[PDB]
């Protein structure tokens, strides 16, 4: 319901070689998965 009202939080403050999934407010009741990798 409430989400576009204000920022429930924050992430990231300037960096290199970084990735993520920013999802807040209300999650969904199901299934989720993710994978990542890097060399050197």
For the bound state, the minimum distance from the C-beta of residue 38 to a copy of itself, rounded and expressed in Å, comes to 5
Stretch 21-40 residues interacting with a copy of itself (CB under 8 A):
21-40
Q: Is 10 a known ligand-binding residue?
A: yes
Q: Is 6 a known ligand-binding residue?
A: yes
Q: Is 13 a known ligand-binding residue?
A: yes
Nearest of 30, 31, 22, 29 to residue 3 by alpha carbon: 22
Nearest of 29, 22, 28 to residue 8 by alpha carbon: 22
Contact 27, 10 (CB under 8 A): no
Residue positions forming the annotated binding site for Zn(2+): 6, 10, 13-14
Q: Where along the sequence are the contacts to a copy of itself (CB under 8 A)?
A: 1-40
């Amino acid at each position: 319901d409430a989400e576009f009202r204000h920022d429930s939080g924050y992430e990231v403050h300037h960096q290199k070689l970084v990735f993520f999934a920013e999802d807040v407010g209300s999650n969904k009741g199901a299934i989720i998965g993710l994978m990542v990798g890097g060399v050197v």
